[PDB]
Amino acid sequence: GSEEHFVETVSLAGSYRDWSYSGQRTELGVEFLKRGDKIVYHTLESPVEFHLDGEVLSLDKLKSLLS
């Protein structure tokens, strides 16, 4: 799955652009990309809804936003 493969790829780097991977499941998804105060989440199930701060993002947006 496209979105799933994004989770997958960042795991292999442990990071993306300037951010850091995580992987701590919580109530609110699993902790994704951390950078400073910004914690992206992703859903366990599909389609993988990426979130940040409270904005559910989309896959193409997310990359652009992680810049």
Domain ranges of the chain: 1-67
Measured distance CA(18)–CA(1) in Å, rounded: 24
Hey, how many other C-beta atoms are within 10 angstroms of the C-beta on 41? 23
Residues 6+ positions from 23 with CB-CB distance below 8 Å = 11, 30, 31
Alpha-carbon span 49 to 43, nearest angstrom: 5
Q: Say which CATH superfamily domain 1-67 falls into.
A: Coronavirus polyprotein cleavage domain (3.40.30.150)
| Helix (H) / strand (E) containing 6 | helix 2-13
The 3-state DSSP class for residue 13 equals helix
Amino acid at 27: E
Cross-strand bridge partners of residue 31: 41
Direct distance between the N- and C-terminal alpha carbons of the chain, in angstroms, rounded to an integer: 23
